[PDB]
Amino acid sequence: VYEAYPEKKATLYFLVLGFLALIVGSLFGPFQALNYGNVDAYPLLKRLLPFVQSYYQGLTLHGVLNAIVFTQLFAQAIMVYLPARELNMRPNMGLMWLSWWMAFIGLVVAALPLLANEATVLYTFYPPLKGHWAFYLGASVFVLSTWVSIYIVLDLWRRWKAANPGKVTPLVTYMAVVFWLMWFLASLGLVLEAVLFLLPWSFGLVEGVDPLVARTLFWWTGHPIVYFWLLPAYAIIYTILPKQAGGKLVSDPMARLAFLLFLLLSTPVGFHHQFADPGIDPTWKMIHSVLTLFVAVPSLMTAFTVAASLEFAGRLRGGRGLFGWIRALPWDNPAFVAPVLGLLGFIPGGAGGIVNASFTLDYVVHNTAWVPGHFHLQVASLVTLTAMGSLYWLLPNLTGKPISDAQRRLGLAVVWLWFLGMMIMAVGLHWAGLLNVPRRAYIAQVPDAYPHAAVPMVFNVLAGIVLLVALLLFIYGLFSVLLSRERKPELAEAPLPFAEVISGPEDRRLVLAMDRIGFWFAVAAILVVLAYGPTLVQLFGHLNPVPGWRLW
Amino acid sequence: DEHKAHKAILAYEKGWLAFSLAMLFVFIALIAYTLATHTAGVIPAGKLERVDPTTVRQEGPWADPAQAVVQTGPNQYTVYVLAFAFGYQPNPIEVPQGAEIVFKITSPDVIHGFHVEGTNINVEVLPGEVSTVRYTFKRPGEYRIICNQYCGLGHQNMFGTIVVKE
Amino acid sequence: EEKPKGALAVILVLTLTILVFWLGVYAVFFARG
Ligand code: HAS
Ligand code: HEM
Ligand code: CUA
């Protein structure tokens, strides 16, 4: 389980580290959820964790850990380990461990300033807010590691392709490939933003940075990145969940198509974060807007492919008429439940994002509590639940340590409570956002400022309690799954529950075109030059670097 | 079975997209529309318009609060606002009603957000650049301002007042 | 067998849940114009 899958070991470390970050980061969830209920439980937190200086030190830690660190580490896990298991190949073990250390040494550096109130700038870290040099350098080493995750997986792909000249890229790998490529093109924004700017600044080598270019480069990445968070779930949802659901993945071509489109359309859409920015052409905003509606398409596709599989599943599990099939599914299995309730919260998370996405309609909600409400249904719910409810098939598969009845029911509680608790937050936050309460604010330290949002503040108070319980019940879970000195004489050589994939004739024609990964990668690159090219070139000739500020 | 359900999946996966696409197109047709009408004023100006934040309130239009408001058309008034670490100058901003108010906004420190509670004036303000936006207050009264981009430890407490006289 | 209604079902709620949300904000959009 170690010296024949040391790919298991190294995969486990991306997960554990992944899960540390998630814990430490979520700690602040409650206090913030309570904050948006006008309860100020920070005197407590501050007393309980003595290092915390501000609400915003916590927001920083919450975001930077739960959305930069837990995610990337989980992505790295799934999007290397799953393909490697399908191909039955060992990835380059050097470069596999380099990566890991690259993220560890990355994280430690970045945390040093963060924990010391020296980089309280949030996970967007917008200039001219100016953090400690080690936070920029840190995040930079943390991200560049993904570039090794790219190389490693591109290599597995190359190697499988060599011993199968002509043949079509197997499914999970095709997914993982378009994913790494899409992330490579996406990552260029923030990598540029770093190298050409944030590092120079933070060290001392220059004295100004241009807010428009920085937030622009930065956003060329921070939209793709949410697709980067999601796809590893999406992998799991298409190719593993169908099996545990009792049925089969009902289409291989849609799975690839859906993934392709992500390669195609994840990157050129960042002016969806810059709708309220100065110095960017309405023409180009409206352009990015449309291509953003175009990126709804894969996810729309998915709903129906996935819904189909789980109906099929149902119809096999001993299903029934209009609804029945839902009752029929393995509801006592945390690994089915977690990502299904995930999808449940995704339904409304999506209708947020289309609303979000649509230009004129975005100034109804930009920078209100709606956006947190929106993304929490996306990434804190689904992506996280999938990740969570997957410890239960992946962690036995990585340690050969089986899962009891006690733990299976503990999970089921953690899961159902993390769900509704999130659901509830999403009523509150969307609702306050409409009623104009802003995001990113310590609003319980201005008790009288938002009196007209008494009602949804109840929800936000309630979420924070419910979800505090959930989290601790979770830490209880995770540590029990991993410490019980139990080791099975076989289950470690009892692989991932990959799904049977319905297929046939018409696939060959359609599948082959899609397996043209060079051509579609080139299209994608070209797309990006079109979209960001004229805006970027324009800004770069007209640079206006302003000095930095520390307002904490 | 089995294959009697590899065609029939694709069948309505086509049909779904026709419907996915038509719909998203109606959105596109309704958004396209807002462009043609008055509501479009709140889209910032596309044209770069650079300034120096370290001087901004000590020369040029942003210097004296008593100068913020200038007449600029037959029914148009330009208002040069200043968002800055934990406030807005002028405070309050005083503007006439039913006249096309044309805000020009910037900051001397960090990015703030400029959000006229009750309207669509929801523009990001950026150091060194000038945020130009156009709105007409048809219904008079006291309009509040919230900085909705985090700007430091006094972010929660950064409010302004728009005073639309009649 | 045949048609996937539970799917069609789901991609229905979805399609309506979209509408409400969107058309709905379109309201508030003009109410604030
Ligand atoms: C991982 C997280 C990400 C997910 C992915 C996400 C999805 C979308 N988003 Fe978003 N987003 C925006 C547009 C979209 C669009 C168009 C989508 C699309 O991907 C939506 C696609 C989803 C669907 C079309 C729904 C499909 C439904 C499914 C797949 C469920 C099926 C259910 C079944 C099958 C049930 C089966 C079981 C049964 C029992 C029946 C826009 C605007 O264009 C903003 C700007 C707001 C502002 O003003 O700053 C934004 C703001 C954010 C921010 C704030 C960033 C910040 O700090 O500034 C984050 C973190 C974020 C994350 C994410 N977002 N988003
Ligand atoms: C314990 C459960 C959680 C609770 C109760 C919670 C609560 C909150 C609240 C109320 C906010 C908004 C605070 C503000 O407006 O400043 C927030 C911010 C945020 N949360 Fe969570 N959260 C939880 C878990 C997560 C997880 C697991 C993720 C990521 C996978 C996540 C991602 C984010 C992000 C990306 C932000 C935006 C922070 C920023 O504006 O810089 N949350 N959280
Ligand atoms: Cu100025 Cu927040």
Ligand SMILES: [Cu+]
């Ligand atoms: Cu985005």
